[PDB]
Symmetry: D2
Subunit: 340 residues, 4 copies
């Protein structure tokens, strides 16, 4: 039963496994103070064209989001996000556990606009309400859409005018920056945000996120906070290794390109069969609307994620591809689908 | 300029002030372990017909809401409320500062319904989402509407079905229970909720909320939590005195009836002038939609709250009466309004 | 049964009651935005000779301490205090509930010294430990001792050299600044600290603390935090009234002088009977060591606080006087004691 | 320069790496809902003789400690620990960041005793103080000593008497239970604690702690809390693989025995050279008091941790061995030390 459930069902790219195997039995200092982390961080600084930035390696996405917000926010400050943002839905109150409110905006396509930021600022006023101070966006978003350069430039400009930090969640940044509708580079993101992260977990690594802190005010003692939240991994050179391999020779983007090419095969198949997607997609996620009878038959050969059942005898399903997805399985899916 | 801004603009009812005056210079034990809090707690127990309820005296409403959520919720649990609820809007994220999420429901008239609770429970599933465990309602609500006994009984039964606690914010319980459209008593509220509070701040007292804990699982060591959040007032007998006067001889409900009656004079003046209200009201709050040019002239004689500017050259205002509101000011508002409209 | 248990057993000074009674039925704006708070704050600024300071009126001491620490501390920062400090013992984890550690120093006489600050800084180092950032002291302290000007000057200088905020808890500041061994004024405290509070609850008011914020970095949006913690009292002009009466015409200090004169009568009586105090005192608190048999007999006519029973058939008791203490009761205590 | 700095300087035991290699490219369900975590959990259940225990796989020790305190404590409750405990010193206030106080006891040899627990319960009374509810111990401790079965049974019985939970930090449980002075098994620890964890990070694994929950009141929705604190690893099968290899064929205890044996060579060299240890040790940590001039020469060949400079021109150092420590480096340390002393 081949799985399209998520982009973290396989361990790691063979070249990461190889470096981990060949490096075994060497002695390293702990907590990210080692040679691997230093090399990965240097490589990342060069790709961003911001070698002044601080890079911290952290094991997971929820970990990284709650650390970022806790670094950027005073007790009476809040974070703005879409209602579909990962921090609004699927971190079991992680941000609120740090003591801060997520102010949500209803953006059906999963993308924040300047008008939602402005409206969130208009609604929260006086000493009786939280002060929005951080804006959270995801690229790609939690429904597979993504930002253009002009969109991120508009958001960034608005944040600077109102004194807000801008944080970009890059769980699926490899997919985003490899998509054919994309016109952002890593250097653009580093130019336009106060902080962001590059996800390795969903892009070839067994774990790891690279939290990049660009705004000088957010930098001090970040490692203390990482430690306090349980995120300062003792054998931290193993996180560095993920990035030392992925960020070398364009691998990160080549794997991203593959995941998007796989999803494009599924999408061409879906569209040839008259099946509609709930959101537009040029990334590694698809949200087909399939009849329940068809789903029960597809379940015999593929695992999918159920997003939301609907009253008219259909569900929104999610298909997810990754760096590890077998092209042959994508063509099989389409062939099985055509015959249903 | 006479103020209709809110229901906490005047200090306290003269009878409360009288007791504080006569009592002054008498020595008392601290932190609510005194005689006045004991008497207040007993009167409350008898009005609710639950002498087994734990009664805790606390100074403010935000204080009370944050303590109640903290008592009822584990770290991964959450409170359900309307988008207009006090804890969702006007507490500077006090509940979030205790570590908990407020899950909201869009209810345009400020009242939770069973369908909203159910829909909150459906949307929040798996180990990747919070677990809703407490339901928060306000009577009256923050937009001046209020719950009937049947509405509260349906909410209460849905909560028992799904294993949720129900907590009622009674900041404006005096106005609610003295209203002509009301069919709830304090006994009913005690029967149907695990926890609620009776507000004195807005009903005659200088401060004071009485937190009533009814469900036995919420009771133990509540005083430790109150202390921790800075809410265990040293001279606690002074909170007690507020309720020892208000809960005696139906004074609480008589002050509420006065506040509702003053609002009824304002409401009659507004309705004779063709001015519409943004929400229905039989309580102490009114939300007239008025012309901006009208507002600028009213402003010379009266102070009102500005709720929501609209595109079409008008504005939703709030008028609020209290136990202290003067009838002659109410008639005067109506009369200035008729001169303006004509 | 006359009570020497604490300094908050009587409601308020008659002149406060009178102003509250005569002001009743006037309309006021809420949340401290009124005329009474403005006048009290102006009076306090003049007494401190720092009219640039921000003054916020808050109802209680625990409330004020947890707000002060939450204003001064980032998530990985901690507060230094003696083991006998109120925030280390008797706030049921209030500071820790805001997310911060209290680092304690063993100071038997209840006073912090420069060497304890320095030692607390030496012990907490690296990204694996909290960063001490705030120093908490009390005047008078929780065992009735108090700071001299030279002591506070030494502490203040050390805090400035190490980049620490200095916060003084003035629950019993009236007693301290009225004592015959005192050489500090309010103006000295305002000169030497980043923040402190003047307690009214124990000095004539029914409640109220005046949180003074001197350090410009601590000021922004303090009212948001006060609101969030439940401390922004709706009818806040009633707190202002306490201070409008107390800080006028030296009343605060005259009441403080009376509480110290009362304790001096008790102390002269104790010392004439050969009874030792557990700490030196020139303030409104005494800590006599009395035999258990003598305590049972004194309990017939006076209520006292039991501090710590001891194995040799004695207890450390606390006697507390205030602005409201009846001189006749103090002479009675001494007369009863002499005859035991 | 060969390092004796700590017991997490090398990646992982070759057998763990072998399984990860062979398993790579196989698809798995996320968040610990996979086959490897199921097998690891079952092996653990059988070693403890408690197949009813909930086993949760978590990446790090600080992570595990903060989750365990959060599971066991209400907001006004606190954890008792020694002053040398990991949660009192070296977690950047992680427990305090969850909202709870750590109440400490001065125990110079790193071991809690019953008198300490009792004295913590006496000092903390009334609604004005925290309530101690959880006891935290470490085996081995942070200074290399360890608990006997009788010590643990007395601690455990005092906890049952006073209604406290007992939690054991097993970061260095492999070294402790493979030591010659030890008389505890994993079955014993499971019998006498409500919760503990077995550390793989320092005993062969690249990461991994197995949190075992035994008391039924602590169990429900633990996975929601793990998620909330960012500790629910997406590719959770990789944590599982660590224990599926370590808990098979006594490998966990064999690696611990190797680590203790290497330390015994170092300890013998130190004792033949007249050098004293700051605490007694039969585990993988040693705390020699050495001359500063000695240290500067040793530094050219070896890396050690500096614990505490002393006034008299000497210094307490820490030496730490692990499953990966080379015997030839141990003999070499002893030999360089004898040349230096002579």
């Amino acid at each position: 039963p081949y799985s399209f459930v998520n982009d973290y069902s396989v361990g790691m790219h063979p070249k990461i496994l190889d470096l981990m195997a060949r490096d075994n039995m060497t002695q390293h200092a702990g907590y990210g103070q080692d040679s691997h982390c230093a090399k990965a961080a240097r490589l990342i600084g060069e790709l961003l064209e911001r070698p002044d930035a601080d890079v911290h390696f952290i094991s997971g996405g929820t970990q990284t989001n709650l650390i970022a917000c806790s670094l950027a926010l005073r007790p009476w400050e809040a974070v703005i996000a879409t209602q579909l943002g990962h921090i609004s839905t699927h971190e079991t109150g992680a941000i609120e556990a740090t003591g801060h409110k997520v102010v949500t905006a209803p953006c059906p396509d999963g993308k924040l606009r300047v008008a939602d930021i402005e409206s969130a600022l208009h609604e929260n006023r006086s000493e009786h309400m939280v002060i929005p101070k951080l804006v959270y966006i995801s690229n790609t978003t939690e429904v597979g859409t993504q930002y253009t350069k002009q969109e991120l430039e508009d958001i960034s400009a608005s944040c600077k005018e109102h004194g807000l930090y801008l944080f970009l969640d890059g769980a699926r940044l490899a997919s985003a920056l490899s998509s054919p509708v994309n016109d952002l580079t890593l250097a653009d993101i580093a130019r336009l945000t106060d902080m962001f992260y590059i996800g390795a977990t969903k892009a070839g690594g067994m774990f790891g996120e690279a939290l990049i802190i660009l705004n000088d005010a957010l930098k001090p003692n970040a490692r203390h906070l990482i430690k306090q939240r349980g995120a300062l991994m003792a054998k931290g050179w193993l996180l560095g290794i993920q990035f030392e391999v992925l960020m070398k020779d364009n691998l990160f983007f080549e794997l991203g390109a593959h995941s998007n090419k796989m999803a494009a095969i599924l999408k061409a198949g879906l569209e040839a069969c008259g099946i509609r997607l709930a959101w537009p997609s040029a990334s590694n996620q698809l949200f087909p609307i399939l009849e329940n009878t068809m789903i029960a038959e597809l379940n015999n050969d593929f695992d999918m994620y159920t997003v939301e059942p609907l009253k008219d005898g259909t569900c929104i399903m999610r298909l997810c591809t990754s760096w590890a997805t077998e092209e042959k399985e994508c063509h099989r899916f389409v062939e099985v689908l055509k015959r249903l």
